[PDB]
Homo-oligomer: 521 residues x 2
């Protein structure tokens, strides 16, 4: 019945689709015909996107499930069929002149509902192709995306990992579900064994993954080229009006501040007291929970948010505050929504550090912050740097073999972590297990967003004259195709280094405070 | 061709590219301009194809080796670059009328060498697209066969197979190059262990292979549609002007005569003396030089001037034919010829029984097994076209039923065999295997015409061995592959020979 409701929707979308013929070639007949065409394709296209996204999700949740595999395949065919059938649309819009288009808007106010949609198309004149070409590209979409599916299935359904000896001395089956727990164990032997077990399998299949990921990367480059973008990156970022400079700034500022990570790794080595720090030691607790109605403390910390905002264990406290943030942002309407959450966490962290006196408590929150910072800025940026490296290398024609990918990834890892972390041979193959590399320049947004959140909390916590008002107006804006102008209006210019440099300064000061704390105790 | 030669050609080809744009748009300016353009695009395309094919080979031979992954990568990039840069050529030729093109040929005899190739382009007007479309399709070429590349690396480099104890206390590492002889072992424990070891791995990776193979099938179907073909099968078969009727015929007549394979399996079961016959028992043998200079005695005056034996006549087959499907007709025909000569000449019945079985065994592999693959191959394209998802469960269930249909009652339904579809490289070709069975049958009908000394038989054969139209070439030689007859009397030959084997065994 998930596939019987699907059956009804497929049939309905398929039949409605026949009316496509009627709209094609009419755009120049009048504002009315133009409106009707836009109404038709958006309606058909979006109803199909919904079904697609849904089936894809279900597939990802159990990729070994026949019924889900089948549903996702049927939904992919429908999507390409619809995309193909509607591919004449933007080329035909573009056969009109800019001034004919806005002339239609004067004649038919109702079109105002779509102006922002028609605007993108007009602004993208150089990257939209002819009906013939768009038809080929749309119809081939399944082929372009296939290697992501192969990856998903191999990674989640077919790979099986070895057995290890577990925490109580019992046989434990390694798997995606259990691995993270095992990497956090206070039992170092179990950590080392889980890490080596998992990586023995990625190493075995490194050629297959290079092939799947390589193909994915090739498709981005090919599409960028035939659409007249100067690169795959410009292509992905443009459709969100993100200038390439936000990406360069992120990678450059993070590279210039790697010594801060290096230092944080020395501290972790000291805390663990191990002879040598390895990748399999970075996710286990170094401090281990501080001795602590979390609602009162929540509302108290968020006070700097002000009157308007208010009316509208220690880890769970952060969660509560994190959710309130998403909850208030939801009230007005993903990276843009993540900011409202992280900003709140930032405000609770600062509040704790201004009120907590117990050294164990202070240490816990200092390290909790540095830790989140390690994962969301340094690690995601590492990934963003590798993602770009793969595209630029492939575009220059250098083969992305597993050997080259692994040696490259190994080097980048060592650059990021520094001499305090041993160069584990296993980690050269990590590139192959990261799902995000099969998106399209997605991961860097974790790091820019985190930095933005940091800049926004710092403006609020110091009552910068128009800080509150501007943050609230960013809440009232809602999800937008223009994240950097939204941010710019809220006082964070993401094209410039300062906002990341401010976060870095905070990482350093809190790092310095944690060290001094460790020395006293 | 060596790696060093490859690098030399690779380098030169990179350079010649800059001269493609210089010929674009000149085809209507006269016979010379036309000739100059064709000399250039055909040189650069073909030579780039030659080194791509080579790199593709070294890669399939040593898929885990970085040297060859890189070589093949740099060859695929070049080949797609060359294909794209030269993609304007066919559409521009076709902007001329056929009579303008052939007029060029009358005006410029140095074009005559290219007639056959232009014929093909001229015959393909309905399936060649615009410059913009051909450019897009050629540039995406690497994306379209990526999944074949993924198959090869998974299958050749990454999959690790179990270890087994061979016919000593000997620990043998299972691999592709060594599986076959394990299956031929007289030791039943080794056979079964190799069989299950191998399929334990394909079972685990059935989803990944379904995804690479299904992606491959989709590419075919998509290409077929945009080029205005009625199916992927028609699209592939049209390259050698083979009507689909030769494929349907092959499958129908083979299906109709499956009882013959069943009987053969029945007999294998008795000769092996096993209470239950399994897939892993099917390859172990059931039984225990100027002869070649004589065997070809009914081949005519012109022609002239136990396993080792057959191979010398096979290779002497494609050797005489030089004084691919086609060359294999002439080689298999020669084998048909001594099978008859031994059969007529050999007095001792154990030798008589061997060649009988040798023939039927070759038959079982080249016609029945290859046709089974041909049928499944068509089934996959056909289902995918109708929109039915090719999940591994469906592929495996369908492959299971198809395997049972073919082998019949005497053969146990081994659950492992459901996953065989995933290890067969030819499914990543493009409607290729069916030629084995048609070629075999055609070679059989020619041999009969020859051995039976029919009206003009000899003449025709040695007029055949004296192209791109194999069907008509064969028809001229007196065997019509659009009809059932030629396969039906190959089946009679299989049936008669079986009858003789059994009747001998008693």
């Amino acid at each position: 019945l998930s596939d019987q409701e699907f059956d009804e929707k497929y049939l309905e979308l398929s039949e409605e689709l026949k009316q496509s013929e009627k709209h094609k070639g009419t755009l120049d007949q009048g504002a009315s015909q133009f409106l009707n065409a836009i109404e038709f394709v958006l309606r058909v296209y979006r109803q199909t996107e919904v079904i697609y996204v849904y089936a894809h999700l279900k597939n990802d949740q159990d990729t070994g499930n026949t019924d889900y595999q089948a549903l996702y395949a049927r939904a992919s065919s429908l999507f390409s069929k619809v995309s193909e059938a509607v591919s004449w649309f933007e080329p035909e819009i573009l056969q009109l002149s800019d001034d004919q288009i806005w002339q239609y808007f004067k004649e038919e106010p109702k079109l105002e509902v779509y102006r922002h949609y028609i605007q993108q198309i007009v602004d993208n004149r150089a990257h939209v192709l002819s009906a013939e070409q768009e038809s080929l590209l749309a119809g081939a979409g399944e082929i372009f995306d296939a290697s992501s599916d192969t990856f998903a299935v191999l990674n989640n359904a077919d790979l099986v990992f070895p057995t290890i000896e577990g925490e109580n001395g019992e046989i434990v089956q390694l798997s995606h579900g259990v691995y993270g727990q095992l990497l956090e164990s206070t039992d170092r032997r179990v950590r080392e064994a889980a890490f080596k077990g998992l990586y023995s399998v990625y190493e075995q299949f490194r050629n297959t993954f290079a092939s799947t990921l390589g193909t994915h990367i090739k498709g981005h480059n090919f599409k960028a080229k035939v659409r007249n973008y100067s690169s795959a990156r410009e292509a992905s970022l443009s459709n969100n009006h993100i200038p390439e400079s936000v990406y360069d700034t992120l990678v450059d500022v993070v590279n210039k501040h790697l010594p801060l990570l290096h230092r944080y790794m020395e501290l972790r080595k000291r805390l663990l007291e191990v002879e040598k720090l390895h990748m399999y030691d970075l996710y286990t607790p170094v401090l281990g929970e501080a001795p602590i109605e979390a609602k009162e403390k929540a509302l108290e910390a968020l006070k700097p948010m002000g009157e308007e905002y208010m009316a509208i264990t220690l880890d769970q406290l952060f969660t509560l505050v994190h959710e309130m943030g998403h909850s208030v942002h939801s009230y007005f309407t993903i990276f843009l929504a993540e900011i409202a959450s992280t900003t709140n966490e930032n405000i609770l962290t600062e509040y704790l550090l201004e009120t907590e006196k117990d050294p164990r408590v202070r240490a816990y929150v200092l390290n909790h912050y540095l830790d989140g910072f390690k994962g969301t800025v340094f690690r995601q940026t590492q990934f963003a740097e590798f993602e770009h490296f793969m595209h630029t290398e492939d575009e220059k024609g250098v083969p992305l073999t597993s050997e080259y990918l692994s040696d490259s990834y190994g080097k980048l890892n060592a650059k990021y972590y520094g001499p305090a972390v041993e160069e584990d041979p296993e980690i050269k193959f990590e590139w192959s297990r990261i799902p995000h590399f099969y998106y399209n320049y997605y991961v860097f947004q974790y790091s820019t967003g985190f930095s933005a959140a940091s800049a926004l909390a710092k403006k609020i916590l110091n009552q910068e004259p128009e800080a509150l008002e501007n943050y609230l107006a960013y809440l009232k804006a809602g999800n937008s195709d223009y994240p950097v102008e939204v941010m710019k209006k809220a006082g964070v210019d993401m094209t410039q280094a300062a906002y990341i440099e401010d976060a870095m300064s905070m990482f350093e000061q809190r790092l310095n405070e944690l060290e001094e704390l460790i020395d006293r105790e």
